[PDB]
Ligand binder design. Structure first.
Ligand SMILES: [Cu+2]
Ligand SMILES: [Cu+2]
Length: 128
């Protein structure tokens, strides 16, 4: 099975997937994120951050408090299962993580932690 996804977006900052299924037979999984816009990361930063659905609010809130210089993630946040760098126009990043960190049946969310974005830039992730 495929163990990679490419996440891409609009000129209007709309992204092309809101649900990711990680196949159980994957040993690693890769997310490729690319920025579709014209603005730099301090104005329109994008990242892809994975946590349990339960942890998403805490990660987002603490990330906002941490600020741009920390890519809007609290340092040493063990709630974060995997994530990309915060990227801006013309940039891309990839993250590969260990699928053994996921549990079948647990509910996961991926989201952007740039302030205010997570209500729009988010989706589910499932190990199946
Ligand atoms: Cu965003
Ligand atoms: Cu990190």
């Amino acid at each position: 099975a495929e163990c990679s996804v490419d996440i891409q977006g609009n000129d209007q900052m709309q992204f092309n997937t809101n649900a990711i299924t990680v196949d159980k037979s994957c040993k690693q999984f890769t997310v490729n994120l690319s920025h579709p816009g014209n603005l730099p990361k301090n104005v329109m930063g994008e990242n892809w951050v994975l946590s349990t659905a339960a942890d998403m609010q805490g990660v987002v809130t603490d990330g906002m408090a941490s600020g741009l210089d920390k890519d809007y993630l609290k340092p040493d946040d063990s709630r974060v299962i995997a994530h990309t760098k915060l990227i801006g126009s013309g940039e891309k990043d990839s993250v590969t993580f260990d699928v053994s960190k996921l549990k079948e049946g647990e509910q996961y969310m991926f989201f952007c932690t740039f302030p205010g974005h997570s209500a729009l830039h988010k989706g589910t992730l499932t190990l199946k």
